[PDB]
Every structure is written in structure tokens, then in C-alpha cells.
Amino acid sequence: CNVVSKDDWDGITSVHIEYLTRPIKLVIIQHTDTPGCDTDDACAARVRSIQDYHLDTLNYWDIGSSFLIGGNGKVYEGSGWLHVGVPNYAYNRKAIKITFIGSYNSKEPNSQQLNAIKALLKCGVDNGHLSSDYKVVGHRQLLDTDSPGRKLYNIIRRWPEWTNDVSEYKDLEHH
């Protein structure tokens, strides 16, 4: 996949490892709720800032998204296809989490961002990281948040992979 590796954005690769349950049947769309980024360098710096914040202040195992999509249309490797960033909630062991760098309550991601996630998901299915019948939700469907943002959420609701049913995941959390 066309991903910018952790080493190419100078991230911290030595993290505590916990594993996603394969194959993955759930994708959670987020936004960072931060300013956007227009260049490779600015997006790299933002991804670094987020990983530093998650590691050192929130004490996550790694950055809290599997992949991050900057306004430049590039995907930056987060916890990746295999590993877990957020140590709480059972659904974080059963979902690939893709966040868009920026805030998308008032505007949509641009054309290269949406193309980028389309290609990323298709590559995940090609590699078997993602089962062919994976479902898509916005983080707001599982957590009290506006993430991924009103406009982006309205976008993903119209994807064939979206689903409004999360009862299995709520139930898994309760159990």
C-alpha cells in the first residue's frame, strides 16, 4: 500500500505491541480535530505531534489511529494493519481506525484524501488485512464524539460498506 511509513515521518516505531484480531471486519473513520496540513512536511510534523501526545500524555501504546490521511492526499502509518494503539475498549482490537488530519464539521476532505482512503481500504482487502465484507462506521457511532465530523460522516454514510448497526460491538463491550 502507498503508505508513508513511520520511519519516513520520523515516528517512534518501538511501541508496546498488542494485536488486532484478524481478519478485520470493522473500519472506524475519525478526524483529528486539528488544523489541516497541505504538505508532506507539515503532515509529518502533525502526525509526530499526535503520536507524542498519545504516548506521553494519554499513555496509549501508540498513536490512536491505524492510518492518518493528510490534506496532501498521503496516508501516514499509525498503528498499521496489525497492532493496537488505544489500550481500552474491545472494539479497538477488532477495527482498523482511519483518521483524516483536520476538522470536517464544516467542510469535506478534498478529492485526493477521499481517493487515498479508497485506495487504502482496497489495498487492505487485497492483502487480506481486511475481510472483503468489512463494515464502516464513524467513531461517533461507538463513542460520544463528533468525530469524524458532520460533513465527512455524511460522506461515509453513503458508502456501500457503511452500517448503522453496532449492537454486536456494544454487546462485546458490555460482556
UniProtKB/TrEMBL annotation:
- Name-wise, this protein is Peptidoglycan-recognition protein
Organism in which the protein naturally occurs: Manduca sexta
Q: Which GO molecular-function terms appear in the entry?
A: N-acetylmuramoyl-L-alanine amidase activity; peptidoglycan binding; zinc ion binding
Key words of the record = Disulfide bond, Immunity, Innate immunity, Signal
Q: Which cysteines are joined by disulfide bonds?
A: C1-C123, C37-C43
Q: Which domain of life is it from?
A: Eukaryota
Family matches, as InterPro entries:
Amidase/PGRP_sf, Amidase_domain, Peptidoglycan_recognition, PGRP, PGRP_domain_met/bac
Which Gene Ontology BP terms does the record give?
Answer: innate immune response; peptidoglycan catabolic process
Subunit and interaction comment: Monomer.
Q: Which family does it belong to?
A: Belongs to the N-acetylmuramoyl-L-alanine amidase 2 family.
Q: Which residues form the Peptidoglycan recognition protein family domain?
A: 1-143
Q: Which SUPFAM superfamilies would you find in this protein's record? A: N-acetylmuramoyl-L-alanine amidase-like (SSF55846)
Q: Which Pfam families match?
A: Amidase_2
